[PDB]
Each structure stands twice: as structure tokens, then as C-alpha cells.
Design a protein around this nucleic acid. Structure first.
Length: 115
RNA sequence: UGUGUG
């Protein structure tokens, strides 16, 4: 299987059901999603902005429902930035999506607080 | 029910 053409606005479904975190500036955090939204829905939503390595809606392991937040990993930071610029404020159902770069460790702090 | 778990 393959994406059928290099001129297409879409790609192969090699990114849904995964969890791989994208490189620096290429990983996204999405918030205010529907509770029935899946990993393939978030992929097909973000497909137009570049090539996606991994796409995931955070699903509750107890009930199989979405927690209204998700993630998208591009192969480069310009496609991720273009998706922030296109999807931050996107109206869906009856509410607007919030979109930005993902949170991650990039800092350190002191051990003892008393001396 | 604010940051890729199952």
C-alpha cells in the first residue's frame, strides 16, 4: 500500500494508532476536541498542512471515550507551525479548538529548598 | 476530564 500520488493533499494511514513524539518544533497539542474523535479523524483533519509521522486523540482506557485533547507529529516544524496558524480557533460541533506546540522537559531546578 | 496512557 501507498499514498497513490506525490501530488495528493493526503497520505497513507501510517500515523493513526501510534504515539511517536515528533522532533523539536514539529510536535503539536490540540484541545477542545469531540469525545467521539479518533486518531484517524485527527490525522485526516491535519493532513492538508504537511506529512504526519504520528497522530493521536487521548482516549480514556476505562470507557474508550476522548478526553477532548490530542496530538500531531510532523516530520518538520514548518508544517506544524502552518497547522497552528490554520487550526487554532477552528470551530467544530459548537466549540473552538485550541492548538499550539506540545509540552516537554527542557529545563532543571534546585534539589534542597532550605539551604 | 490541560499535554501521546491502553
Amino acid at each position: 500500500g501507498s499514498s497513490g500520488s506525490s501530488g495528493l493533499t493526503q497520505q497513507s494511514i501510517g500515523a493513526a494508532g501510534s504515539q511517536k513524539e515528533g522532533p523539536e518544533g514539529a510536535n503539536l497539542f490540540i484541545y477542545h476536541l469531540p469525545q467521539e474523535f479518533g486518531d484517524q479523524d485527527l490525522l485526516q483533519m491535519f493532513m492538508p498542512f504537511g506529512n504526519v509521522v504520528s497522530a493521536k486523540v487521548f482516549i480514556d482506557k476505562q470507557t474508550n471515550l476522548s478526553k477532548c485533547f490530542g496530538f500531531v507529529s510532523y516530520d518538520n516544524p514548518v508544517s506544524a507551525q502552518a497547522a497552528i496558524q490554520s487550526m487554532n480557533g477552528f470551530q467544530i460541533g459548537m466549540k473552538r479548538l485550541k492548538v499550539q506546540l506540545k509540552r516537554s522537559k527542557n529545563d532543571s531546578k534546585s534539589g534542597p529548598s532550605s539551604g
